[PDB]
Amino acid sequence: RRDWENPGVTQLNRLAAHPPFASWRNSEEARTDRPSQQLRSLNGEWRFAWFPAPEAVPESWLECDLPEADTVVVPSNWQMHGYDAPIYTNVTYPITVNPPFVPTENPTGCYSLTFNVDESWLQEGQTRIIFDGVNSAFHLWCNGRWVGYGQDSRLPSEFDLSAFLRAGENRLAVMVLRWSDGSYLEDQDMWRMSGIFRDVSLLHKPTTQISDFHVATRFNDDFSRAVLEAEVQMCGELRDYLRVTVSLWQGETQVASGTAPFGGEIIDERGGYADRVTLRLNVENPKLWSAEIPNLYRAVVELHTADGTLIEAEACDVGFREVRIENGLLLLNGKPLLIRGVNRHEHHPLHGQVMDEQTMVQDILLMKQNNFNAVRCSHYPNHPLWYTLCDRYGLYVVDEANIETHGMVPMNRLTDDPRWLPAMSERVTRMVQRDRNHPSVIIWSLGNESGHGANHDALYRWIKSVDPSRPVQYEGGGADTTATDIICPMYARVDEDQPFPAVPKWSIKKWLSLPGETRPLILCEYAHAMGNSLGGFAKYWQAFRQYPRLQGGFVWDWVDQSLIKYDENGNPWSAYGGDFGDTPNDAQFCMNGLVFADRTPHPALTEAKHQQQFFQFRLSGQTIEVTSEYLFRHSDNELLHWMVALDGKPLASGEVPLDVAPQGKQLIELPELPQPESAGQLWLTVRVVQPNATAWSEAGHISAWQQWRLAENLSVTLPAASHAIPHLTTSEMDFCIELGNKRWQFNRQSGFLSQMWIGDKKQLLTPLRDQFTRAPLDNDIGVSEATRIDPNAWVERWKAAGHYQAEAALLQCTADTLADAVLITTAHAWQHQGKTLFISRKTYRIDGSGQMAITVDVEVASDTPHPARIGLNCQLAQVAERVNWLGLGPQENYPDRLTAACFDRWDLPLSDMYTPYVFPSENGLRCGTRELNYGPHQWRGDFQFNISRYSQQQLMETSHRHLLHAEEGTWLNIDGFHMGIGGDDSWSPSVSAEFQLSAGRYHYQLVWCQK
Amino acid sequence: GHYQAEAALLQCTADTLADAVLITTAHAWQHQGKTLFISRKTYRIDGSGQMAITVDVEVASDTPHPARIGLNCQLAQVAERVNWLGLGPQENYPDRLTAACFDRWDLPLSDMYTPYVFPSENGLRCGTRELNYGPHQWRGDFQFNISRYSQQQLMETSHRHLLHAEEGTWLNIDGFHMGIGGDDSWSPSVSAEFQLSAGRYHYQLVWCQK
């Protein structure tokens, strides 16, 4: 019947969805949430055979194992085993758009397993099998007999196997299809894989069982009282002796308990649900749940006979919290939330889309350590364990239905079609039915990028109906349609409007006050972290803090979707779109994370951690005002550490206990600071330290920090008198200056410093020249589809203007001998096709002390696209182990992404001055640098710089970091000015005007000498 | 002490180039043992009779942002016309110059002074690349005001009718000038982007025969 090409058939014989069950037969075990003998796992070694299409599968496979099959591990994505290639496409579907049809050549994975079943399981009760995740559709067989069918890759499919099993050995046969009508609703921007990627288990339930249960918590005005209501549903033999007891626990103390027989209240003319009961438990002064303090209670639901016989027990963690929208604000337990969130896909560089506990824990610890308090399940229900973890560690969650039809034209072609309503409703309803009891979930999402159709409105209402405790949001069709309680745009900018027809992305500040608008605004996606990005991140957070109704957003996104491949030597390297023969593909657009696939942070993570701090500071004289942005907890594990340093030199320091109530303030007056002797700038640096370890951080953890410039005493003392006088030697070809063991050589043909000698060794491999370009960042390339080349992208404008091809034309090069120095004056003009782009005028003054003062003045044609940078570069002949500097650091920082960096004395190994972005680009820059030390060299002034073994040219010509090769010597790029990196999105110019080098005339000066 | 600051010479040297004389100077402005600003300059006079003045200023970060960063002098001559290539023709400042247009403007010297009843800095014109007055010509990228009244007199006179034209012509040429503000006139109202807080500034002017 080809059910995989019929949106009308999304399952066959599948059991109803419900909350996590373990069918404990002992209440104490359910209370402690210990393992259940009634719940077995079938994960492990299975048999697998790949086929080009289902019609290729031999009939024998249903009854007997295939010799050609191999033994592989499950869960797993078969692309991760090499049976076929994983495909990375963003918007464009991986198959021809001809709904509900899929390619005749449909990759088919035949999984099979021989397992044992204890006769005890078949003598009573019900035995079902559960597939937590199968991509994308499958047929099931047990001992040769067809069982059922299922679709939707992100929610569990359950089947009753009671009448198929036999005591002893049994054999399952699962035929998984890569493509199905279900694929049309799974066009998320990620790797397209397939197989049984989530747990497979066997559950045993009594004939008379708990088939479903809902837990709700209502509160009085001040949350000093609560009522926990638990609706429990049963199946099987309904009798007067049956009872349900719901007891609530706080540790080993039972705080509440209620018992009752079945038979709900009357609801209509036909009566009520005789197979249901609702228990109501009163709880005084309940401990409230939040990401700040994840207080949890344990609820045990016991199905039993009135006289004391337990039939079965189920249970869940209960988080007492109220989520409601009032007067335009999203409130948690009555307080306005400030969502510090991030989008997180389920990705692993080695295992694909298979998740494991360790990876989940690592992510959560890293997220909380970096001040995140929320996560969005982009763009499908997650692995069941994820929610449990979020409940226990404390993270607000946006549970999103597995629905995305981005490739359709228009985007809502299927979501506005009533014939697709059935398939869609199952993706929404089954999600809610599964996760409604998790306190961590505070908002339901109808899916992602599927336009806005009537089906969305229908399902929006369905949820409001069945679960009035959680707000419902959906961004499609404009981000503010009738299908969302929250204005949830993606990449809407802070101050700039993007008036797209039909679906404009207004400036978020302006969006809130549009006539008639009252809803709160929380971006479902913003600050695209693709490669060297997150510029302008601070601008969002300043707005979030100033506008009550701007309540945050979810950064896009958590981790690069890169996969590991191996070279001929068996060495691993990160791969992206197209690296597996997959085509069409969207190359590196699958890597947009704050951390690498292996979870190593990207420089942008620190910027996020800083802007998302929970403590705000203000300075007034000797007083530091600390404000808490916590809504519930007190600062009971925080101490303030302060330090005053003069140009990196520690003068004073100390620590003060932090004792601020949520939303409160605390004043801390610093001691009488001693007026410094030396000249220079005094800097005050404060940091919040967590003395004690927690469940998510180690002792000493730094959660916040801030810097301030204090007093400054400008140096008015003239340096000592020079002993010698530099000597000039002229030739038609050069101007050579000598002073002791030091020598400078200027080429009279090029007009550049071509060499220097410190002692008996040369210092340059390449002449010191002007640089007005940079290896393009992903934000400069600005493309989200490897097929669209936006001529408006910065890289395209620089290329068309000739910035990368302009050649320096010498206009002047003269030498002058002064009383105590030699002066070299030069002027160059860079041109492209008779067009003068830049003009650089310099002077090099080498005096008797051995120092070279380089004064640079540049003119940039007002009509040429603003340049990426304005500085100099050269390849030093030597390679040193350390890089020392007085400026912003220690990590990479750019003009629009440097609030996190601190001014101080930093010292790192050369390697740390290079950021390993998978797709190479300008990187490792450090700004606000007053002094740079490398080997025998020292540069002084006020500049930005990056130093490494890779030239801008190599970075520019290389697609993968693993293909880079250290060049001889060290490449140095010292800029007087550098363009912002942007990142509001990576498919259009996103660098704010204030970070564009548009001044027309620039000036900077550097002093080069020996250390 | 900005109104008290005293120029204290730190350096003053002379050098002869192939076709010019280079005067290098350095000054420090202090008050109560505190260096407010450091002005470093070079003067280059070439054979064409042009004096190129390069100025680099340091402003202590802990001192309030200065009202302006420039040079001034009282010219002996009194011409009746003022010609310049820049924003105009009317008085305009950094945060109030959108209405002015870049072009060649020529007005009588009086028009270069705004008669506010309560005297104060006035008549400035921004984004100027060339200014002509009598036999003088100034080129660069600066703001300037020119009139018969010194900033000192304007600052000491409460009513405009009490102002007296001084001998010669006072010239104020600024590489940078602070915004005037106005959101209200009873509290700091000059927006951050219009405050001279960069710490380090640089500008260049060329003085020559008209």
Ligand SMILES: O=C1O[C@H](CO)[C@H](O)[C@H](O)[C@H]1O
């Ligand atoms: O709009 C979006 O932008 C992201 C770009 O990386 C990614 O494709 C998300 O899934 C999509 O919702």
Ligand SMILES: [Mg+2]
């Ligand atoms: Mg179907």
Ligand SMILES: [Mg+2]
């Ligand atoms: Mg998409």
Ligand code: NA
């Ligand atoms: Na807000």
Ligand code: NA
């Ligand atoms: Na992407």
Ligand code: NA
């Ligand atoms: Na504390």
Ligand code: NA
């Ligand atoms: Na590249």
Ligand code: NA
């Ligand atoms: Na006055």
